[PDB]
Symmetry: D2
Amino acid sequence: SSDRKAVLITGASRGIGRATAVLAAERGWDVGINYARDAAAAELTAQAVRDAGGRACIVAGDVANEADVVAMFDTVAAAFGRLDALVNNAGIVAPSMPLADMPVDRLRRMFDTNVLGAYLCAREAARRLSTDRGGRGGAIVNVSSIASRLGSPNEYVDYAGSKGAVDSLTIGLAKELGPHGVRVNAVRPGLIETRLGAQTPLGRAGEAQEVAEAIVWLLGDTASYTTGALLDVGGGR
Amino acid sequence: SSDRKAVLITGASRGIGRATAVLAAERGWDVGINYARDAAAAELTAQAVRDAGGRACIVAGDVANEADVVAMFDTVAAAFGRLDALVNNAGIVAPSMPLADMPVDRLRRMFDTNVLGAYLCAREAARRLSTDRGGRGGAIVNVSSIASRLGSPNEYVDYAGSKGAVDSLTIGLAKELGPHGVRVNAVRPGLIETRLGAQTPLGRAGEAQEVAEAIVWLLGDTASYTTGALLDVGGGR
Amino acid sequence: SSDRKAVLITGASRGIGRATAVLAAERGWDVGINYARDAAAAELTAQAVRDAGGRACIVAGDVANEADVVAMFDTVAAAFGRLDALVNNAGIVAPSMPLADMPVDRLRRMFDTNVLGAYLCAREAARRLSTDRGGRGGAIVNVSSIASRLGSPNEYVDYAGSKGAVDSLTIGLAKELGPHGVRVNAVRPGLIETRLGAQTPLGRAGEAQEVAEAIVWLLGDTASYTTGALLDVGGGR
Amino acid sequence: SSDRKAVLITGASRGIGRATAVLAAERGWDVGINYARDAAAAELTAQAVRDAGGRACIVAGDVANEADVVAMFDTVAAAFGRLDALVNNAGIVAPSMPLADMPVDRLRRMFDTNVLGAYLCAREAARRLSTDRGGRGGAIVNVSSIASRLGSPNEYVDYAGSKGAVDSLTIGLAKELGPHGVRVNAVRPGLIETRLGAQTPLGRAGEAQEVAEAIVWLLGDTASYTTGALLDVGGGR
């Protein structure tokens, strides 16, 4: 017996993912903490979840790999006996450069992680949360970026495109899953601390917590008529 | 002495405005309740604010009239000894028709209320909340509509344009006021109860409360890196 | 007898309006040249239309004034015996400043010209071009601005809002008038010559002619499935 | 010796690609016609190019395969002795269904073709057209879809995302390549003939030619200040 809802967060070992995990716990959720390689960081996130009063379940996996994604969801469901939500947050680290200089391996990693991975995880949430497929309803939040509308020229135009895909996914899947009890929204963070931040209207980089607040709001019941939204959290940029 | 912040809400006698007033009170705010003509409804909103634990100040005025707007803000400041926020919500009621059939008096009322009025109130908030003009910082939320992106053809294409102006105001003023301690966001409600609602992905019209939740979130401190956002609350449409 | 189509252009005495008039003439149109005060400049535009092979009809009027707008359209129809199109281009000149400093008279002029005026002219085109109201079909192009998405903070946030209204008008009216043989699109020019221009990706301000090209394309038959579009002409900004 | 510019069009064997090839030829271009499998259809497009007065070069290749993309560009350059433009148009055919039912192989094909392929081809155009990398400048047009903003729920939400990526690519790459003499734009076609078309404001599906007109305009010199644009060609939807 537990009246806490369960959220699976991808890329939850650091940054926005970690803050979201901890905040969701403070707000009454149990949390599946997915990570790719940094298991020690994931365990620190889990301890922070537990300290905040939540159950935590750590789960390794490549979001681009179908078998890993099915196992991730299966694992969280095993642990908590339920699944109520997904936060799509996994990303990659890549160097700043123009498209012309980017090698194909980097492009593939960017799209496989940010596009295919977000689709596979959203697909699994669709299968498991939709009321027409046996689920109890729920919410998905996709983490996008202001890069989707700004383009990250000379830096990460591939990342920019990947988040454009996430924005479009959000709009379409919200429509698709609305009749089946599942809301789908996105946050579009700007510059978030881990000197451009200083050039934004609020005059600073954002804190991961500040993005987490937006995520956890969109996951909760007070957001009940909010689906298909794209919520910029970028300091006015 | 009061640690409650003060928000002036325009068109607060009914609907989204009323729900926002009541919810803001439940969440620790005192509320200036502006109305155009329906004083009895405004007084009912005030009683609901007071019942929720807030101070309420009722204030009549045409948002399109500069003298009324200055008096509205002056009045709330008198009552509470402070101003922390504005919700731009005042609107008009107009019949459904194509642009070709709309009389000029209706067009003028639509734009004077939804465009000029929103600008005059935002201007006053800018004068009074900005840290560079003696204020303590704060937040503005503009109530827009999904009509800004859908166009309300054969119904209210003038209303649609007015909310397009509000979306653009939001973006620009967020940038303009960010360095001066003031966040500016908008909610874009869809169909909100006072049979199209049934054709939205969530399969129903929204409740005013559901929009109020989004407004009050954007007004509060957990939205601290969120400015310039346009937050759809339209059930997936 | 004339196989040339007729376009009424508002604010056609200078800049984008003038270039559009001249280019439309080069491309086979006759042109109504509306102006507010600068009759000498309008006459120079007319001579350029005539030199390019078109008939020209000069017509004074405030687009914000219903009687002037009805007379403008009546006049062009008298001159050419037909009306096929409208370019909504009239604007105002205003100084750069934050909203907080703008006087109410400036705000009113901005909105009356850019919002009410665009609606009254679009309304008249709707009445006269729509096939269900006796017209032969046609096209409307609204001149908006990239300011609608950028916000012109600390400069012209009122102008920004006005063009946000124009973008929304475009979307809605396109839907509304599609079944009645009338396409409606907008161009969103960036910095256009009459040192920010130097900071755009193409590294310069645009020429009025360059915007005129986009306008005249959207007016012509090769744009036959293009309606509701918002066409940025801003050098990548 | 030839004063005709050269454009490489991906997926040029049928539909929008074919119409663009033929129209570009009518308007003074030589054309590289890329195809994946349907060589007979590509040859028919080539004959239509030649009949219109252009040189044609047919070139097989998977846009998702780096070696094929480099060979495609190398081949066109060999044939014509120059490269001036790219139209990114290659796509896949997939059945209509909700995301939950889509198999992973279909998702991969969609993204590899519409996202990775568009990036690899755009990357090659960046390498070859940019003035800072030895090229003579030029233009890229990406073929997107109104699906990027509508989401294609219950049909092709993966395709929708892929075109969201293309829209973001367009914005970013326009900024990135503006200083190096290359414009980058997108067309977003709606329903285009190869009963939803009947429900659009213009009351019909569009013709491939109608999209080709928009593409060829964006490729030409009269579009000289137009870059980063997203040009809807969807009948008002």
